[PDB]
Design a protein around this ligand. Structure first.
Ligand code: FE
Length: 674
């Protein structure tokens, strides 16, 4: 029965926290309030293990994620939208009724701001007006940001502004408080009273500030659209300045995350917007004193939604907003390589192509999706199942591979590229598709379309069980939990760390040819590509385990039993699948797609420097690309991931999402609405 040390920054907030403490003492977990001066003091308290959680604004949730605080957003607020209650709000600009000045005429006016560092009050409006050339701030060599704002505006009320005095001229109160972040004219509703009393011509607030402050006088104010029109206050869909992320509940990244959210689940369920108590956790909104509103939680919010455990401050705000805040403070492809083997092939690509391709080594393929969403890496090549999880993350494929003919990728008006998913067993083994429940299994990795998605999607259609370690006896699927039966048959890397059941090239049973090595050594069935039997047999694989392997040592498994020869994969397979793809962010789609063709013309199967380096040769290990790849054909512009896979493959990958979503899929499903 522990307690959560909450930290509040204002005295009115301390009274609401203490009234929250008296109502939660009966519960199993409880609360303790820590009075502090500013938000920077509460962040130093949580990193010092003195406090636990604060509801910060997006511009301040950026500040918590920096070292050494390294705090993490664990809960977000939910605002009301008529499309659906998502976790974002709009930044608008409110002016008086019937006045003449447009958005270009804001030079020399008087403004009211929410606070120095807030999203809707400072980052968005100043970010826009400096991007539109109105404010003059080439960089930090000019000086502070607010020195340019004091030169731009005549006078204003910026709570928390220290160096400049024009930003404190319009604030109400005695000198000691007028500038502080808890002044009367601070916050979303406090800056609106700067407008209503006449200290400013424009107030930079969120979209629903006018509705809760002046409910019946809504027509006495106008929103300042970026074209120059004074649209009314109910037109923020057409007049917003940006759409910014919600206010986030930051905390440490430790065991204390789980007991905080269970407390927030307890308090919201009893003190939400539909509660019957006199106490409300959110508001309730209405005409009140400006310092009495927005205490510990904004009055516009209606619920709290949990942030997934993989998010941080960078991936919460999005790329376009984090790049804006990073700007005010202060031809080459960045490939993502997984493991030591792909990194040792990629540095070879870097030196033969002279620096135009550079790469960062990671440990798993889900790290490539995050470093590309962060923009720290450019491109990566993913299997068909990982294209779906990168497509829901916001990335799009731009190029794909051909296996059938090098000539066909020229005439792009042709059949779509594809391969096949088969099940390979040993010769004299009597195992077929029916009695597969008691047998062992060998996959290529969990989540990939060849070994995991097609076979488990057939099984999930067969038995309807979302348990998939249970359906087999044991096996080796790289990336599955180490303490489960789908990791015991994994041989591991054999190095200093056992590295058992890891989803990189260190594992001996990882990959297309790796799952075949699991079949011959210790296994009963291998779920792999249609041609991996052909590539390894015939004396081509110089590995000791495959020294004398031949094509007749294996027999494919049809769906209706019916063990058939490996050369007839057109008839005896599980499902047709799309090929691998290179997924990237939509912004940099045009830059690499013509650049990757310049790399392929030098290093392809008809490349000029294939004596120097071959892009599509990997010594039967599939390093950065498969070895069946002949040429890369460009995917047309605007092709989304739902169009690239096709509705045939999109049906099974959508249904298999419901059983066990991964952590990389869970945070991206949070990012794109629900
Ligand atoms: Fe694949």
């Amino acid at each position: 029965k522990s307690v959560i040390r909450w930290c509040t920054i204002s005295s009115p907030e301390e009274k609401k926290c203490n009234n929250l403490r008296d109502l939660t003492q009966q519960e199993r977990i409880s609360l303790t309030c820590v009075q502090k001066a500013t938000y920077l003091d509460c962040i130093k308290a949580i990193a010092n293990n003195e406090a636990d959680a604060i509801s910060l604004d997006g511009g301040q949730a950026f500040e918590a994620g920096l070292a050494p605080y390294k705090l993490k957003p664990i809960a977000a607020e939910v605002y009301e939208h008529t499309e659906g209650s998502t976790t974002s709000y709009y930044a608008v600009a409110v002016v008086k009724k019937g006045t003449e000045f447009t958005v270009n005429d804001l030079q020399g006016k008087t403004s009211c701001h929410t606070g120095l560092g807030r999203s809707a009050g400072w980052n968005i409006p100043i970010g826009t007006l400096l991007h539109r050339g109105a404010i003059e701030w080439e960089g930090i060599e000019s000086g502070s940001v607010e020195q340019a704002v004091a030169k731009f505006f005549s006078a204003s009320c910026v709570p928390g502004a220290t160096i400049e005095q024009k930003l404190c001229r319009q604030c109400k109160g005695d000198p000691k408080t007028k500038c502080a972040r808890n002044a009367p004219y601070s916050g979303y509703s406090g800056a609106f009273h700067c407008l209503k009393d006449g200290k400013g011509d424009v107030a930079f607030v969120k979209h629903t500030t006018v509705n809760e402050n002046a409910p019946d006088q809504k027509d006495e104010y106008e929103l300042l659209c970026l074209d120059g029109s004074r649209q009314p206050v109910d037109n923020y869909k057409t007049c917003n300045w940006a759409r910014v992320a919600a206010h986030a509940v930051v905390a440490r990244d430790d065991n204390k995350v789980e007991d905080i959210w269970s407390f927030l689940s307890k308090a919201q369920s009893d003190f939400g917007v539909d509660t019957k108590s006199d106490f409300h956790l959110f508001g309730p909104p209405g005409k009140k004193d400006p310092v009495l509103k927005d205490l510990l939680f904004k009055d516009s919010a209606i619920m709290l939604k949990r942030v997934p455990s993989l998010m941080d401050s960078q991936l919460y705000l999005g790329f376009e907003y984090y790049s804006a805040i990073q700007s005010m403070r202060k031809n080459r492809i960045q490939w993502c390589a997984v493991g030591k083997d792909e990194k040792s092939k990629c540095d070879r690509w870097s030196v033969v192509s002279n620096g135009d391709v550079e790469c960062t080594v990671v440990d798993e393929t889900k790290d490539c999706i995050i470093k590309i969403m962060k923009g720290e890496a450019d491109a990566v090549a993913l299997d068909g199942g990982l294209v779906y999880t990168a497509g829901v993350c916001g990335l799009v494929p731009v190029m794909a591979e051909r296996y059938d003919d090098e000539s066909q990728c020229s005439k792009t008006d042709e059949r779509p590229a594809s391969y096949f998913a088969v099940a390979v067993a040993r010769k004299d083994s009597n195992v077929n598709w029916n009695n597969l429940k008691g047998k062992k299994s060998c996959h290529t990795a969990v989540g990939r379309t060849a070994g995991w998605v097609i076979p488990m999607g057939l099984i999930h259609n067969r038995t309807g069980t979302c348990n998939f370690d249970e359906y087999f006896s044991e096996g080796c699927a790289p990336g599955s939990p180490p303490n489960s039966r789908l990791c015991q048959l994994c041989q591991g890397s054999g190095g200093i760390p056992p590295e058992k059941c890891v989803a990189s090239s260190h594992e001996k049973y990882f990959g297309y040819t790796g799952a075949l090595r699991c079949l011959v050594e210790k296994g009963d069935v291998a779920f792999i590509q249609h041609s991996t039997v052909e590539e390894n047999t015939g004396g081509k694989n110089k590995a000791d385990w495959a020294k004398n392997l031949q094509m007749d040592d294996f027999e494919l498994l049809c769906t209706d039993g019916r063990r058939a020869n490996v050369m007839d994969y057109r008839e005896c397979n599980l499902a047709e699948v799309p090929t691998h793809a290179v997924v990237v962010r939509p912004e940099k789609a045009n830059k690499i797609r013509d650049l990757l063709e310049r790399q392929e013309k030098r290093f392809g199967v008809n490349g000029s420097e294939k004596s120097k380096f071959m892009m599509f040769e990997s010594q039967n290990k599939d390093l950065l690309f498969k070895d069946l790849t002949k040429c890369l054909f460009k995917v047309r512009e605007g092709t989304t991931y739902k169009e690239f896979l096709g509705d045939k493959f999109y049906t099974v990958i959508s249904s298999l999402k419901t059983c066990n979503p991964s952590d990389i899929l869970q945070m991206c499903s949070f990012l794109e609405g629900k």
